[PDB]
Coordinates of C-alpha atoms and ligand atoms in Angstrom, one line a residue:
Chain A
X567 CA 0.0 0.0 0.0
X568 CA 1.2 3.6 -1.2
X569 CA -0.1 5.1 2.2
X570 CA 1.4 2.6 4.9
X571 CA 4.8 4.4 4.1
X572 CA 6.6 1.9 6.0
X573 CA 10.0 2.6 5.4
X574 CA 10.0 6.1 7.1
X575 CA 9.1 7.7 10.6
X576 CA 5.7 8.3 11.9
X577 CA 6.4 11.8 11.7
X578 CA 7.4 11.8 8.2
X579 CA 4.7 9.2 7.1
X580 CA 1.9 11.2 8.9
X581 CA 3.4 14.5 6.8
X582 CA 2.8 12.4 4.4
X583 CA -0.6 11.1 4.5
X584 CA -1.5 14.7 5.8
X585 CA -0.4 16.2 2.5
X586 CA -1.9 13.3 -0.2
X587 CA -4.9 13.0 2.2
X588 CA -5.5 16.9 1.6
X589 CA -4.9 17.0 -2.0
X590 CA -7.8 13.9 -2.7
X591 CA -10.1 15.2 -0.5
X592 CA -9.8 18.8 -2.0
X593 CA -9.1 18.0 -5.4
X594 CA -11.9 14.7 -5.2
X595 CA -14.4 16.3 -8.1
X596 CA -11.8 16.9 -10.3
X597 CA -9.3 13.7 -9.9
X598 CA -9.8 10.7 -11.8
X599 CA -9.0 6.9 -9.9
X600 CA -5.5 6.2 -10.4
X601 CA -5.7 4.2 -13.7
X602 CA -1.8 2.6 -12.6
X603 CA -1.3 -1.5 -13.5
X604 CA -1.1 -3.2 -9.9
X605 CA 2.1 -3.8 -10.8
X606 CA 3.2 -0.5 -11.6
X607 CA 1.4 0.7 -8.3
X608 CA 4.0 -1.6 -6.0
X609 CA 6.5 -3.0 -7.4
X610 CA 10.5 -4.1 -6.1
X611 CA 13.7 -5.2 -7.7
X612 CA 13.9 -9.3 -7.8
X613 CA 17.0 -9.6 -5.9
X614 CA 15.2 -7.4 -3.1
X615 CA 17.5 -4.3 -2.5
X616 CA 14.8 -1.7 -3.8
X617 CA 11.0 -1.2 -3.1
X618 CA 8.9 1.5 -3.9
X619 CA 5.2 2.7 -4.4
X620 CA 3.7 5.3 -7.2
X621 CA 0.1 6.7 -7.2
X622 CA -1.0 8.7 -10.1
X623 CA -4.6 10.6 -10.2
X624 CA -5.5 12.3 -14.0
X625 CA -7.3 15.0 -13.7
X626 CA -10.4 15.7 -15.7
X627 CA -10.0 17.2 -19.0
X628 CA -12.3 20.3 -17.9
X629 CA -10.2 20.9 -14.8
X630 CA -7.1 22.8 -14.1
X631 CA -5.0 19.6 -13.2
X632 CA -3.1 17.5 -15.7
X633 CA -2.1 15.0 -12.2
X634 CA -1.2 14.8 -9.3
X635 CA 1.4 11.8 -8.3
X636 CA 2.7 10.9 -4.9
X637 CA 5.6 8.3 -4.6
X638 CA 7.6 6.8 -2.1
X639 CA 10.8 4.6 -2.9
X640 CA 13.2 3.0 -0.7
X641 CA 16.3 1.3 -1.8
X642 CA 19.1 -0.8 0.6
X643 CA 21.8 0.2 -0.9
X644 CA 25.1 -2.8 -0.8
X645 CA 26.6 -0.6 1.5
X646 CA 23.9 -1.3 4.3
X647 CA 22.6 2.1 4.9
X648 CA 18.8 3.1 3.4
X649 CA 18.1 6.0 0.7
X650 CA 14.0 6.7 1.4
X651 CA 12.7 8.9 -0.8
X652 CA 9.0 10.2 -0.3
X653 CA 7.2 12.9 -2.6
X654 CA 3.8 14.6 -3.7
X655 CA 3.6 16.5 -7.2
X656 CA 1.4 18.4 -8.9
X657 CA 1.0 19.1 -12.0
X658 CA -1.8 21.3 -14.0
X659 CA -2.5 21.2 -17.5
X660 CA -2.1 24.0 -20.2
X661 CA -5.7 25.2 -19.7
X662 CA -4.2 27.3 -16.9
X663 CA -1.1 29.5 -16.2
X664 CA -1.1 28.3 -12.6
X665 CA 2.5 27.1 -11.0
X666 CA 3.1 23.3 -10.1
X667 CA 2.6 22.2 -6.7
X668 CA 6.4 19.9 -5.0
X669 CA 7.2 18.2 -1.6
X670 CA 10.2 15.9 -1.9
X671 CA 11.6 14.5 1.1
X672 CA 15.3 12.6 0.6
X673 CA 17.0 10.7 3.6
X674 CA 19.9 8.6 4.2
X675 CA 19.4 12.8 11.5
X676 CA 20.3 14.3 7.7
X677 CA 17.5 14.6 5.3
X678 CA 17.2 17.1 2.7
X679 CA 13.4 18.8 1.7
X680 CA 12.6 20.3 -1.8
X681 CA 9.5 22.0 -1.4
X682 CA 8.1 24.4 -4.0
X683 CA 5.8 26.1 -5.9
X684 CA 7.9 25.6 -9.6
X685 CA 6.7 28.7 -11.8
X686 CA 5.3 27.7 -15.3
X687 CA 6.0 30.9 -17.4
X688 CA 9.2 32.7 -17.8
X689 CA 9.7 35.2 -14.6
X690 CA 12.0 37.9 -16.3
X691 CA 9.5 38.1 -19.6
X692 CA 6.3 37.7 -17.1
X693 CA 6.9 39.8 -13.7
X694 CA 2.9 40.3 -13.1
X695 CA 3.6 36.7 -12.9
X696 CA 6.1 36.9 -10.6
X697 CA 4.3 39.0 -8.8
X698 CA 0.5 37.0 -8.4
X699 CA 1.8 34.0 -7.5
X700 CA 5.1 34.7 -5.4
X701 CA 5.0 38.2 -4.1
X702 CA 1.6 38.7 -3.0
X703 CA 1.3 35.1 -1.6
X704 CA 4.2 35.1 0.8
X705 CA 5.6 31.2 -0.2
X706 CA 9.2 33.3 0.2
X707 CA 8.6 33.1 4.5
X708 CA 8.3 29.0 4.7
X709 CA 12.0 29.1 3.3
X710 CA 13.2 32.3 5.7
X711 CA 12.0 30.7 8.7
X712 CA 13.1 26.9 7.7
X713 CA 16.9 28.5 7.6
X714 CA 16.5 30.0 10.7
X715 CA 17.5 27.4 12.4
X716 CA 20.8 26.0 13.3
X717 CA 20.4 22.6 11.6
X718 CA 18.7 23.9 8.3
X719 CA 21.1 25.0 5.7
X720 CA 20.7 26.1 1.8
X721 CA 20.8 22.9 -0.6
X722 CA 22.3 23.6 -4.0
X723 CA 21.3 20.8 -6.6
X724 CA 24.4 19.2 -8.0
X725 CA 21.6 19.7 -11.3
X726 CA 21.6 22.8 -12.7
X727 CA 18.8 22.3 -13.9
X728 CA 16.8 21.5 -10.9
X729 CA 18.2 25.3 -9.7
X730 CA 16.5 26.8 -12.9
X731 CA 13.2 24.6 -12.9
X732 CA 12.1 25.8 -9.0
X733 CA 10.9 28.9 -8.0
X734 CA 12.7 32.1 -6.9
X735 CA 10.9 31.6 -3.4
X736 CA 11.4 27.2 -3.4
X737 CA 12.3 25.7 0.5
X738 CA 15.7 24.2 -1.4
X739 CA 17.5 22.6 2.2
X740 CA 19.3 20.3 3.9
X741 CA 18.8 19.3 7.5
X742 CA 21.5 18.5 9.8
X743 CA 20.6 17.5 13.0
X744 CA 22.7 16.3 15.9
X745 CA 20.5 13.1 16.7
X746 CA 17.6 11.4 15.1
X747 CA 14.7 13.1 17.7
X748 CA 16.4 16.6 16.8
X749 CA 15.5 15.9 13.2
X750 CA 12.2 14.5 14.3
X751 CA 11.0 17.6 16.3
X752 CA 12.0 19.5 13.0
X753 CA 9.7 17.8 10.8
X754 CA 6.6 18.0 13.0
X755 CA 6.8 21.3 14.1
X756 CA 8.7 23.2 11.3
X757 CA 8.6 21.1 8.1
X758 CA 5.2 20.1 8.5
X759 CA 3.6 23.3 8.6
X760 CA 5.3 24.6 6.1
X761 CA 4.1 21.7 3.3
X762 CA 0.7 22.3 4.4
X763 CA 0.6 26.1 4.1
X764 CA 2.4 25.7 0.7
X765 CA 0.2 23.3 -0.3
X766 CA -3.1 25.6 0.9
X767 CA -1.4 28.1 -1.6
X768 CA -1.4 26.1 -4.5
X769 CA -4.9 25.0 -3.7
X770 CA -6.3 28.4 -3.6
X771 CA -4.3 30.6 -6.0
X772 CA -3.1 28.4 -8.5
X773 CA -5.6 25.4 -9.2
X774 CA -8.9 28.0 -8.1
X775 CA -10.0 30.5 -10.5
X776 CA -6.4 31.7 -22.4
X777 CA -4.2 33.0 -25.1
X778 CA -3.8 30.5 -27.7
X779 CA 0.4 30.8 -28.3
X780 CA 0.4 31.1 -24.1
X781 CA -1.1 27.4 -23.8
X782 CA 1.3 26.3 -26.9
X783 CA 3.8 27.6 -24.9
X784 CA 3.0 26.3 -21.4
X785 CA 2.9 22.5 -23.2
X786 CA 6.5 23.0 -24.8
X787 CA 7.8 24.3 -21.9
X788 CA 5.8 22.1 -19.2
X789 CA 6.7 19.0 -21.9
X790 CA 10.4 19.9 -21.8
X791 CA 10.9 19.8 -18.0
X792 CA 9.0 16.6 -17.7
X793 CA 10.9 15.1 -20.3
X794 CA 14.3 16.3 -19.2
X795 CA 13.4 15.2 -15.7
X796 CA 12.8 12.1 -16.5
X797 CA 15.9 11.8 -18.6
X798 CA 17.9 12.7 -15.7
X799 CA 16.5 11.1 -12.7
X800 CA 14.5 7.8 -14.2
X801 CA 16.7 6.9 -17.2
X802 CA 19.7 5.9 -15.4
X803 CA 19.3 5.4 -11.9
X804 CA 15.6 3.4 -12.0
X805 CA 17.4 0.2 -14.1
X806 CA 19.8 0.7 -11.4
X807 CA 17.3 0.2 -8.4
X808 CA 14.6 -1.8 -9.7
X809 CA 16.6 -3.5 -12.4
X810 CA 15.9 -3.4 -16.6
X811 CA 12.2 -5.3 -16.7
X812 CA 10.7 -3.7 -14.0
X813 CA 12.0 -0.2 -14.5
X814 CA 11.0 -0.5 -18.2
X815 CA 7.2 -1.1 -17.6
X816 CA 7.1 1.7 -14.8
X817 CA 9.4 4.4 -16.5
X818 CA 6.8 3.5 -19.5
X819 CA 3.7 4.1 -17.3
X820 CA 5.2 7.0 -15.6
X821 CA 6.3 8.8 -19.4
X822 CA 2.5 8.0 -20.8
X823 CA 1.2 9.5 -17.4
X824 CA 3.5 12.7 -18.5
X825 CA 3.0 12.6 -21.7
X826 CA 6.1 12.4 -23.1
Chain B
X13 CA 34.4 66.6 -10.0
X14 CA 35.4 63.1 -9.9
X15 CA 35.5 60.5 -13.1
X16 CA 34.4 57.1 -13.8
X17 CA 37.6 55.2 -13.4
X18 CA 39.0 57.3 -9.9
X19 CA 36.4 55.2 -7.9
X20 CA 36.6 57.1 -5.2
X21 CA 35.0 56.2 -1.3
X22 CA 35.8 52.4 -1.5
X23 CA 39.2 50.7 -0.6
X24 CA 42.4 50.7 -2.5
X25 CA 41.4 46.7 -4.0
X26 CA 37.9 47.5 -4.7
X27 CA 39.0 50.4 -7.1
X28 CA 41.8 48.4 -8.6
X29 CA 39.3 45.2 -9.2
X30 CA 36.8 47.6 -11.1
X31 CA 39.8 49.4 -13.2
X32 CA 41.0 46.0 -14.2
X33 CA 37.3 44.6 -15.1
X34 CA 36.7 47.7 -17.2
X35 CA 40.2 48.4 -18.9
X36 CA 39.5 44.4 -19.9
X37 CA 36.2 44.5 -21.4
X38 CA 37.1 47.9 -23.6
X39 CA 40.5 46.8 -24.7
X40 CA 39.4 43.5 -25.5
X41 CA 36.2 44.4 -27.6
X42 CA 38.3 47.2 -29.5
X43 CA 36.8 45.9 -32.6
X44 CA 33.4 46.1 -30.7
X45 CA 32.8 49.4 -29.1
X46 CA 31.8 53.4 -30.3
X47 CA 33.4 55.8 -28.0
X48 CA 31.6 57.1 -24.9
X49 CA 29.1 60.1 -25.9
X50 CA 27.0 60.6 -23.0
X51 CA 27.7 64.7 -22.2
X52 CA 29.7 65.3 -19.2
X53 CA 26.6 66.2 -16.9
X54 CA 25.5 62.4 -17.6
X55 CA 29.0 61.1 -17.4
X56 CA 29.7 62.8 -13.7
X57 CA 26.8 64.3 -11.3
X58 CA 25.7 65.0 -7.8
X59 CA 22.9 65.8 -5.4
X60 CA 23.4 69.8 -5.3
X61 CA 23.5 69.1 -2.0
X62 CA 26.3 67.2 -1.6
X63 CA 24.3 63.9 -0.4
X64 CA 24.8 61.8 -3.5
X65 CA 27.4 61.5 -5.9
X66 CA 27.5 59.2 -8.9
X67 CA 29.8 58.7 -12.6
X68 CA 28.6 56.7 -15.5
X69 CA 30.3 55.4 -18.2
X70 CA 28.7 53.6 -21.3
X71 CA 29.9 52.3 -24.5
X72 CA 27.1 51.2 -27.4
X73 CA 28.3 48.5 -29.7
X74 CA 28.8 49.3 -33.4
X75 CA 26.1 48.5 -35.8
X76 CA 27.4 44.9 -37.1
X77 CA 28.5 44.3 -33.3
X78 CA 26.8 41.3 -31.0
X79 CA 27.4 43.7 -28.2
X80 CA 24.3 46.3 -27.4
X81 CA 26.9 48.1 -24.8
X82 CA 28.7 48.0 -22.0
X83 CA 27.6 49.9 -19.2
X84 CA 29.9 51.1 -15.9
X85 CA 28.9 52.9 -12.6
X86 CA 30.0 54.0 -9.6
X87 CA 27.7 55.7 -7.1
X88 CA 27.8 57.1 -3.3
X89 CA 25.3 57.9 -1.2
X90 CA 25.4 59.4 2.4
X91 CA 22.1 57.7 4.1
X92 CA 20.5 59.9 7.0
X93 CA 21.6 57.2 9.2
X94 CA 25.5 58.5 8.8
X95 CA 26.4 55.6 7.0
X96 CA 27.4 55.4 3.3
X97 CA 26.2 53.4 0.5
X98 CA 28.9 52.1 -2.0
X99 CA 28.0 50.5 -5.4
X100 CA 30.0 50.3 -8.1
X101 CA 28.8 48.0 -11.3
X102 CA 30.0 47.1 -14.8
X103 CA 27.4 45.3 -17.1
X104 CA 27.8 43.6 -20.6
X105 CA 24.5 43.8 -22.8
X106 CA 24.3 41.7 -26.0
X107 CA 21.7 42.4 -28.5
X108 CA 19.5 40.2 -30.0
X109 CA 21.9 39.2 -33.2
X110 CA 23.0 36.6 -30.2
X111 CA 21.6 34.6 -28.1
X112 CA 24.1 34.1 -25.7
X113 CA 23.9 35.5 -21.8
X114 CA 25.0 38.9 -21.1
X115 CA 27.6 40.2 -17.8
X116 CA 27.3 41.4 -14.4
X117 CA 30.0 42.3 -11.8
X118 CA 28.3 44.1 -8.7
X119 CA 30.2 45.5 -5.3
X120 CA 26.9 47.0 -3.5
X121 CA 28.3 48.4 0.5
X122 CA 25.3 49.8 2.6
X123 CA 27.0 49.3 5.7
X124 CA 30.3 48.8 7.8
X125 CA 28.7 45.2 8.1
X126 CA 29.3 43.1 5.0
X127 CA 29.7 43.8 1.1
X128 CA 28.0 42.3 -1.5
X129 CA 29.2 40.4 -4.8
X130 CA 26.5 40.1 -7.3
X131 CA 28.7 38.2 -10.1
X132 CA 27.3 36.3 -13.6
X133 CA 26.4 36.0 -16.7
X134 CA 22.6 36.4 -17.1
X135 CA 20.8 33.9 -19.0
X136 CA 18.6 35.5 -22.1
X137 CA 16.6 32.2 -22.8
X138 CA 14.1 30.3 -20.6
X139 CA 16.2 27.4 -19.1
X140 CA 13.3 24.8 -18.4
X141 CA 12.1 25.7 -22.2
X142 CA 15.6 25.9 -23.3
X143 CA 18.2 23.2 -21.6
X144 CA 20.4 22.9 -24.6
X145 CA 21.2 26.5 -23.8
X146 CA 21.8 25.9 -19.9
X147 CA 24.3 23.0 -20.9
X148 CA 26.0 25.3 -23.6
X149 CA 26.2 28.0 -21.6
X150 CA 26.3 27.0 -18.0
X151 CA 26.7 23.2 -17.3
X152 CA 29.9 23.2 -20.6
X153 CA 31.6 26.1 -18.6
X154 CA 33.3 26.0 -15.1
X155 CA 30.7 29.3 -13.9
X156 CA 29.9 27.5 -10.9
X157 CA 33.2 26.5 -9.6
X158 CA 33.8 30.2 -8.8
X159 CA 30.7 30.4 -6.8
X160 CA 31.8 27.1 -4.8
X161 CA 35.0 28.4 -4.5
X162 CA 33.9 32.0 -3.0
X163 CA 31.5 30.4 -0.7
X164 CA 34.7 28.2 0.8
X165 CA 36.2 30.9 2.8
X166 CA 35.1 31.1 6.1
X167 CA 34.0 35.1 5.5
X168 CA 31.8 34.5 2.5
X169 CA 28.4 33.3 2.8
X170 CA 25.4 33.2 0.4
X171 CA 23.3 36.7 -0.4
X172 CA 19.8 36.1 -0.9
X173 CA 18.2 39.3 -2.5
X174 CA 15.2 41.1 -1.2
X175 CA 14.0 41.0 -4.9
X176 CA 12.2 37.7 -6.4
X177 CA 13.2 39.6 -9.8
X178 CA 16.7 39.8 -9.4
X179 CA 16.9 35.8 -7.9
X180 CA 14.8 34.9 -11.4
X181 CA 17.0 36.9 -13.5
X182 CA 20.5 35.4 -12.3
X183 CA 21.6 32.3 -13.8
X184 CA 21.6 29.0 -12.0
X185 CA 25.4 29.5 -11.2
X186 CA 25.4 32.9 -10.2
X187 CA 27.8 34.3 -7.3
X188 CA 25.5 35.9 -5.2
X189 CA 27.4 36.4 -2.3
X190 CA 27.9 38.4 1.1
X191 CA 31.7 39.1 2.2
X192 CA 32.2 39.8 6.0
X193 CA 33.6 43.8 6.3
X194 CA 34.5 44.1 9.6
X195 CA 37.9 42.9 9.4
X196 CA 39.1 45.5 6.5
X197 CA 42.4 43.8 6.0
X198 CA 40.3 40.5 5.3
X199 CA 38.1 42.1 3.0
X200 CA 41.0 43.5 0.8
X201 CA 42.8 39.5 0.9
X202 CA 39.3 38.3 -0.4
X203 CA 38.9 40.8 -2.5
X204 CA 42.6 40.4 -3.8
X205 CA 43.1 37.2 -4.2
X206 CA 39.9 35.4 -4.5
X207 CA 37.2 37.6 -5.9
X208 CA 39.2 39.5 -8.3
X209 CA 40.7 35.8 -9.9
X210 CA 36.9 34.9 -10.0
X211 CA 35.4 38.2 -11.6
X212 CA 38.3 38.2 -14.1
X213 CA 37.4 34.5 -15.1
X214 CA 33.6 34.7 -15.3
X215 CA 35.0 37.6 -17.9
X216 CA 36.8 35.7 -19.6
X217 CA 33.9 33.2 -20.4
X218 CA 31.9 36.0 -20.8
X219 CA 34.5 37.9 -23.6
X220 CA 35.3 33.7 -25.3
X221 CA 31.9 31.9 -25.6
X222 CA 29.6 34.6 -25.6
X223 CA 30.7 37.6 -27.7
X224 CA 32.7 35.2 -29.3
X225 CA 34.8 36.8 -31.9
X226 CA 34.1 33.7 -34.3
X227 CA 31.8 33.0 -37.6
X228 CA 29.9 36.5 -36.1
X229 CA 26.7 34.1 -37.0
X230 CA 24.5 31.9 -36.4
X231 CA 21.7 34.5 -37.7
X232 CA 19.2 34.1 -35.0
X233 CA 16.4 32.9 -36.2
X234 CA 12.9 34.9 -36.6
X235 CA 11.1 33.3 -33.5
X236 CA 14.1 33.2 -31.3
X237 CA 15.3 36.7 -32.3
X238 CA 11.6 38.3 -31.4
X239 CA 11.7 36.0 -27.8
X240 CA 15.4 37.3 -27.2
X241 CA 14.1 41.2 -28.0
X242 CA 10.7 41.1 -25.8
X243 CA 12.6 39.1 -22.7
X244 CA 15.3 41.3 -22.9
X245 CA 12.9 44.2 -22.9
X246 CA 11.4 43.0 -20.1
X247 CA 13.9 42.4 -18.1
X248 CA 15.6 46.1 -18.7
X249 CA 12.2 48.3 -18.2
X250 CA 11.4 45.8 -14.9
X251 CA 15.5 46.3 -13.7
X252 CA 15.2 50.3 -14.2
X253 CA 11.5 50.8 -12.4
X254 CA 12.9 48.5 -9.6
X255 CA 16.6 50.5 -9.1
X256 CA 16.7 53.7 -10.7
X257 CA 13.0 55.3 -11.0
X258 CA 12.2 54.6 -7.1
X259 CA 15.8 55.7 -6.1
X260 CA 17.8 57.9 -8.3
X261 CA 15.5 60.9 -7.6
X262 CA 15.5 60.7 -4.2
X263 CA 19.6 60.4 -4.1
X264 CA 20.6 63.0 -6.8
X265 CA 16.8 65.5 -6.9
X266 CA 14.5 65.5 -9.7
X267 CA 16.7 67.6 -12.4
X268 CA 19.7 65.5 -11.9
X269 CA 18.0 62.4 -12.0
X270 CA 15.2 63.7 -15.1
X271 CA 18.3 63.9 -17.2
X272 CA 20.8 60.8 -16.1
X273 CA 17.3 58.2 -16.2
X274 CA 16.5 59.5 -19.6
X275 CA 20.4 58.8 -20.8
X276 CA 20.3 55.3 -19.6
X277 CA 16.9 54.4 -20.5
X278 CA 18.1 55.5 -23.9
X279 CA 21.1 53.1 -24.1
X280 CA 18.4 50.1 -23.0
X281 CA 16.5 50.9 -26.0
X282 CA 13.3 51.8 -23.4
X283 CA 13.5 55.1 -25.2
Ligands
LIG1688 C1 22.2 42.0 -15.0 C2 22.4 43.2 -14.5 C3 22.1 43.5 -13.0 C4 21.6 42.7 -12.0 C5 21.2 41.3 -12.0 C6 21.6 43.5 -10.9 C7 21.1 43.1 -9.5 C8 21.1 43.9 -8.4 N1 21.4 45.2 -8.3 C9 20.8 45.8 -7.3 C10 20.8 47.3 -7.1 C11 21.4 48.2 -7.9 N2 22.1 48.1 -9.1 C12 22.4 49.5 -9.4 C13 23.2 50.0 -10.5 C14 22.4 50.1 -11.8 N3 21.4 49.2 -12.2 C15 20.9 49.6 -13.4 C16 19.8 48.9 -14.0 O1 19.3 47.9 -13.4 C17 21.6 50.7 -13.9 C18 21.4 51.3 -15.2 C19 22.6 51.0 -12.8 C20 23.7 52.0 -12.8 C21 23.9 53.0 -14.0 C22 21.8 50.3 -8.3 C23 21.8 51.7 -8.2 C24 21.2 49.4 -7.5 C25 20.4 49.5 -6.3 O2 20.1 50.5 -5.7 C26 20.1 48.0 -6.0 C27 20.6 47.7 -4.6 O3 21.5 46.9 -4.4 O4 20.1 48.4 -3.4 C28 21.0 48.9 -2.4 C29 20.1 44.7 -6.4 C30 18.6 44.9 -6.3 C31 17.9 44.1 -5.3 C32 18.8 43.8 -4.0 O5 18.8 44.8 -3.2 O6 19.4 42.7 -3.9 C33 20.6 43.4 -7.1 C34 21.6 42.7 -6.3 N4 22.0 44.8 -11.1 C35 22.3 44.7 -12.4 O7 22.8 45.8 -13.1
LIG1689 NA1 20.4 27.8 9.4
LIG1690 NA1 31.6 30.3 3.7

C-alpha cells in the first residue's frame, strides 16, 4: 500500500498522509481513480535491495490539473545504509497558467526537503507573474523561517537544472541534526507546517479560479521539464534500483502519465 | 568633479578590481565598441547638496557588433543614518543578433557590516524551455566553480536578495554572495586574491563563448530573435523601475535624475 509508508518515521509518514490526504479530499471532483497497472502501483527489484510505491490521479480534461502523483521509494543500498525517498507532485494542464505544486523529502538525522511552488512561465518576460503567484502570496517566508535554524542549511542541486526549474521563493534545504529526535522535532513542528501552508497556496491561488500561443507555450515548456526530468533522474538510476524489466514497464507508465 | 575610473570612497582593492574589469572588457572588444558620448553632466553628477554623488560610463556597440553596450557605474550615497552606500557596477549587454547570456559584476556596501558580490552572466533564454542553452552555456563552462569556491572561505556566505526579480533573473550558477567587512584587512585579501581571480574569469567566459569573436553568425532565427528582444525588454524596463526610478530621484533631486534616467533608458532601448 502507497499510504502505509513503511519505510520512514511516523512523523514523516503522517506528513505524508496529511499532505496526499488533503490533496484527494480537496481535489476529489476533479481527480480521476489512479488508472496505474497493480504492478506499476507496488513494485520491487527481484533480488530485493529496492521497493517502492507510485500513485497517479488524471485529472479531468475540464479541470485545471493534468495530475497529481505521490511516490515513495526505498532502496538498501550494498553498502547497508537506506536511501528513502518520499514525494507529492502536482502538476496542472495547459488550460491554466497556474505554478506546479512539489514536496520531496530525501533521507539517508540528515535529510534534505525540496519544497516548492515551480513557476510555469518565464519570470523575467512575465513579472505580473512573478508578482501574483510569489509576491503577494508570501511562499518566500516558509524558506526564511526553515533556515532560521541551526540545523537547516541552503541545498544547492548538484543539477543545474533542478536550480532553474524551482521557484525564486522554493524551500531548497538540507537538515543536519545532531541526533535522530532533533531531526524528528523539526519535521513536525517546522517542516510540517510549512508543506501544508504551501500546499493551501497552491490549492487556492493556483488550481482555483487563455491566449492561444500562451497554452502552446505552457505544453512545450511544461513537456520539456517533464521530459528532461525524467531523462535525468529515471533513465539511469531506476534500471539501477529496480533492475531493466521492471524499470521498463514503470518508466513507460510514468512517461504515458507525463506525456512524453 | 570626480571621473568614472577614480572610484573614489571604496578601498584601494575595490578600485583596482573595477579598473581592471573595465580596462579588460574595452580593450578586449576594440573591434566592438563606439566611444563614450554621454555629455559630461551624464558622465559625472551629484545631489546639489552634496548627499549623492554618482559617474557613469557607457559604450554602445557598433552597428554589425553582438554587443548592445557596456555599461559602468559608480555611485555614493550618504544615508540619514550617517552611514554610506557604496555600489559600483559594470554590465555587458548583448543584443539580440545573439543569443548568448549577457555580464554582471556588482560590489553593493550599505553598511560597515558586510559587502556584496553580485557576479554572472545572465541567461537570455528560458532554461526549463531551453536546456540545450543551460548546458551550452552554464553546465559546458566551469561558472559554478567560482561560486563554490567564494562560498569556501570562512568570510563569505550566500546573499539572498530582497528581490524575487533579481533571484529569477540570475543564472543558475550565479555568485551571489555576502563578504564579511568588519575585518578590513580580510576584505581586501578576499577581495585580492579570491574575488578578483573569480570576476576576471567569469569575464573571460563572458569575452570567449559569448561575444565570441568567431563565424559572427548563427543569424538568430525569426522566432528566437523576437523571444530574445521582448525578454530582454522586459527584463531592462522591470531592472530600471525597480533600481533607478524609485531611487535615483530621491539620491541625486528631480533635475539630476530627469536627465541621467532619460540617458540610460536610452542606451536600453526603453526610449
Ligand atoms: C544583470 C544586471 C544587473 C543585476 C542582475 C543587478 C542586481 C542587483 N542590483 C541591485 C541594485 C542596484 N544596481 C544598481 C546599478 C544600476 N542598475 C541599473 C539597472 O538595473 C543601472 C542602469 C545601474 C547604474 C547605472 C543600483 C543603483 C542598485 C540598487 O540600488 C540596488 C541595490 O542593491 O540596493 C541597495 C540589487 C537589487 C535588489 C537587491 O537589493 O538585492 C541586485 C543585487 N543589477 C544589475 O545591473
Ligand atoms: Na540555518
Ligand atoms: Na563560507
Amino acid at each position: 500500500k502507497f499510504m502505509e509508508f513503511p519505510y520512514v518515521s511516523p512523523t514523516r509518514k503522517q506528513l505524508m498522509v496529511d499532505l496526499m490526504s488533503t490533496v484527494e479530499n480537496r481535489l476529489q471532483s476533479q481527480l480521476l481513480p489512479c488508472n496505474l497497472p497493480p504492478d506499476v502501483r507496488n513494485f520491487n527489484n527481484p533480488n530485493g535491495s529496492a521497493e517502492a510505491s507510485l500513485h497517479i490521479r488524471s485529472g479531468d480534461k475540464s479541470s485545471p490539473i493534468d495530475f497529481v502523483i505521490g511516490s515513495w521509494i526505498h532502496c538498501k543500498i550494498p553498502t547497508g545504509v537506506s536511501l528513502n525517498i518520499t514525494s507529492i507532485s502536482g502538476f496542472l494542464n495547459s488550460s491554466t497558467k497556474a505554478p506546479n505544486f512539489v514536496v520531496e523529502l530525501i533521507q539517508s538525522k540528515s535529510l534534505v526537503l525540496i519544497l516548492d511552488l515551480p513557476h510555469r512561465k518565464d519570470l523575467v518576460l512575465n513579472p505580473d507573474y512573478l508578482k501574483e503567484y510569489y509576491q503577494d502570496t508570501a511562499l518566500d517566508s516558509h524558506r526564511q523561517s526553515l533556515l532560521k535554524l541551526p540545523e537547516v542549511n541552503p541545498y544547492v542541486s548538484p543539477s543545474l537544472f533542478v536550480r532553474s526549474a524551482v521557484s525564486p521563493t522554493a524551500s531548497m534545504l538540507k537538515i543536519d541534526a545532531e541526533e535522530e529526535d532533533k531531526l524528528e522535532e523539526i519535521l513536525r513542528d517546522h517542516v510540517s507546517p510549512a508543506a501544508k501552508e504551501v500546499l493551501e497556496v497552491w490549492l487556492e491561488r493556483c488550481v482555483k479560479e487563455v491566449g492561444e500561443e500562451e497554452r502552446m507555450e505552457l505544453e512545450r515548456r511544461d513537456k520539456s521539464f517533464r521530459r528532461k526530468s525524467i531523462e535525468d533522474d529515471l533513465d539511469l538510476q531506476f534500471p539501477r534500483m529496480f533492475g531493466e524489466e521492471v524499470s521498463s514497464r514503470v518508466v513507460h507508465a510514468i512517461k504515458e502519465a507525463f506525456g512524453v
